[PDB]
Symmetry: C4
Subunit: 88 residues, 4 copies
């Protein structure tokens, strides 16, 4: 279950953070790697979508702790583009 383990790893990493550029960088990276996972054919679409949603939830929570509103909208936009990218 590569998608859920990647989401797991990235959620773990991100929860530790008290910097917002750092957490944003990591969230977008995790989303990139979630999309890369599907493109190579190594997990089904539904699994990647689940991972994206869980990672994004955690990342947006952290960002809201640090008050990083701009970054929150930026990650949501990227999440929506990533979401489109996965469904072919």
């Amino acid at each position: 279950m590569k998608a859920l383990e990647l989401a797991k790893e990235y959620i773990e990493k991100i929860k530790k953070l008290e910097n917002a550029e750092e957490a944003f960088k990591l969230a977008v990276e995790g989303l990139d790697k979630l999309s890369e996972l599907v493109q190579e054919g190594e997990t089904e679409k539904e699994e990647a979508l689940k991972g994206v949603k869980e990672l994004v939830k955690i990342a947006v929570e952290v960002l809201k702790r640090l008050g990083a509103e701009e970054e929150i909208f930026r990650l949501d936009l990227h999440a929506h583009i990533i979401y489109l990218e996965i469904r072919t």
Copy 2:
């Protein structure tokens, strides 16, 4: 008619606002939830598209009252990505 009722609720909320980050946050949230509505299979595409257009119209009107041009373009971009997201 879940889409129109969600658009209705969000239009109602947003019209009350005199803050631009608040109205922007709410518009994008409503658009997220409009897209989420379809993904679960709980309303047809045409209905969600209508809701997105009506919500976006109201939100952009409010934002123009408060002079929030940056946010206006940001919501339009998100509206277009959401629109793509709905049509599979």
Copy 3:
């Protein structure tokens, strides 16, 4: 030929400008209306794509006159999203 006439009208409007927020606003509006043209079924995809390209060329030229680099990238991104929006 609704697409080319809309592009024509908007190119005409935009060439007159010496403000960059104004020209950007108008370019994005023209692109919105170009996409709206297709959605209603009132011109073929190829025609709208042509109009988008010509309008975007003119708008980016004007913006470069005024040195509005941020807006240029923003219009290009919106142009690419609009382009995706048209091809279903």
Copy 4:
């Protein structure tokens, strides 16, 4: 192999840079031209995707040298939109 030669030309250009707005401008331009390559029917999708990935890797490396984080996220977003644009 038009895609790889375009990526090659642009990678060559970009490696020379010590300005971040310049390298960003060039990366996005190369990605535009990579997408334009496919639309005219002059290279297969897989080739353009390879070129986009290699160009983006180099550009993001340069940008990280110059500390241009905002531009990095902007190029990644554009890379994802370009990627969607290529797969029809």
